[PDB]
Amino acid sequence: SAMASINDSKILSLQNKKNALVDTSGYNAEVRVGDNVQLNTIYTNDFKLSSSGDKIIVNLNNNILYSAIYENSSVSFWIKISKDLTNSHNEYTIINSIEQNSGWKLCIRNGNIEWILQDVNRKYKSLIFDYSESLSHTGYTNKWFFVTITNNIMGYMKLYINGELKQSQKIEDLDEVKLDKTIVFGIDENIDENQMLWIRDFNIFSKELSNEDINIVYEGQILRNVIKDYWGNPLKFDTEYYIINDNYIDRYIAPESNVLVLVQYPDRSKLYTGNPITIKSVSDKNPYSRILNGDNIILHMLYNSRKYMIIRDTDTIYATQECSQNCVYALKLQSNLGNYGIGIFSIKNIVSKNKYCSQIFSSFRENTMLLADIYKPWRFSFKNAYTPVAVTNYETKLLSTSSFWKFISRDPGWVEPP
């Protein structure tokens, strides 16, 4: 099978075992983790480079007969780069195997990540990807994204992002590139507070992975059944989120006359605007545990310093009385907290390479899916509102962006002043 072929080719795999980051490929690289480097804070095999001088040094135990590279190879990992590091016009070297002349290195510079392969003469080839897109919400500033480098020493070096090919450069025309002996993770440039990044699931393979192979690794490491927050972190219970609809990214959820509506951000550049919603486990899973596909959840909104439970309206938005076809329900708040079916929802990941988003469903009385669009949701006013609603008969809306929700947590990689 493709997968066996894949995993079998692993010649370095940095994973957390017994609370230490080590090489689990079988090849016994020495992995020296700096004393202040925090491991396993978001995902099991992650590490955070955040304090001055944070470093991980890996010393390979590899071929001693070939001084020069003799086989194809690939490198994969996920990376998440803070807003403050992204906003710098400076250049930062993040991973480096160049000891004297040859080797490769990963750099960040003005919202771009650049991969460099260099030979013994310092002739080099470069692959670049603009992950920031000038801090756009569509881009990947402070967002987990899968990077993959494949090398055909007698062909091309390719750069993939989330399994999509971005850039190719011939490397067959380089002269000698020596086998790596040491790989250094860490920034040596002077950094400011809040300039941090995370790396997870670092692997090197002894072959040039096909695009098909790469998508298999990508899908396997994304953890398909773990719901994600906006940044690509696992979504957690008991954690504050600013919840936004994909069709109205600069509007926040707010109660107006006890009907939830979407109010426009006064400043589109400030993500953390609105009324934080905390997600509660109905089955009583551990505090702060990860939320998964199929979990029953309850939503609590913090509004003007008080907590309320978000519930579906018992009646439909317009009067024709008991509805059982094409029904639309507004959402409301109640101060009585407890397990009420009318307030129980379930969240399901949407498969997308460019957004971390989910659909939210209710099965109370009638099966509904939450979406946002323009409605007249008040019983005593004809006023329109961008309104989050629970709608029945939603089969034709399953691919509609109006049904996609994102959960923005206050993340250390995106800092906003009080």
Swiss-Prot record:
Region annotation (N-terminus of receptor binding domain (N-RBD), Hcn) ranges: 5-224
Part of the intact protein present: 863 to 1276 of 1276
Ligand binding (N-acetyl-beta-neuraminate): T314, D315, K332, R379
Protein name according to UniProt: Botulinum neurotoxin D heavy chain
Origin superkingdom: Viruses
Region named Ganglioside-binding loop: 375-385
Outcome reported for the amino acid change (mutating R379Y): Significantly decreased binding of heavy chain to synaptosomes, whole toxin is dramatically less neurotoxic
Effect of Q264R: In strain: CB16
Domains: entry comment: Has 3 functional domains; the translocation domain (TD) and the receptor-binding domain (RBD) which is further subdivided into N- and C-terminal domains (N-RBD and C-RBD, also called Hcn and Hcc). The N-terminus of the TD wraps an extended belt around the perimeter of the LC which occludes the catalytic pocket. The belt region may be a pseudosubstrate inhibitor which serves as an intramolecular chaperone for the LC prior to its translocation into the host cytosol.
Reported function: Responsible for host epithelial cell transcytosis, host nerve cell targeting and translocation of light chain (LC) into eukaryotic host cell cytosol. Composed of 3 subdomains; the translocation domain (TD), and N-terminus and C-terminus of the receptor-binding domain (RBD). The RBD is responsible for the adherence of the toxin to the eukaryotic target cell surface.
Subcellular location per the Swiss-Prot or TrEMBL entry: Secreted
C-terminus of receptor binding domain (C-RBD), Hcc: annotated span: 225-416
Motif annotated as Host ganglioside-binding motif, chain positions: 392-395
Effect after changing Y375W: Increased binding of heavy chain to synaptosomes, whole toxin has half neurotoxicity
Consequence of changing W378A: Dramatically decreased binding of heavy chain (HC) to synaptosomes, whole toxin is dramatically less neurotoxic. Loss of HC binding to GD1b, GT1b, GD2 and synaptic vesicles, ganglioside-binding loop is disordered in crystal
Consequence recorded when altering F380W: Increased binding of heavy chain (HC) to synaptosomes, whole toxin is slightly less neurotoxic. Slightly greater than wild-type HC binding to GT1b
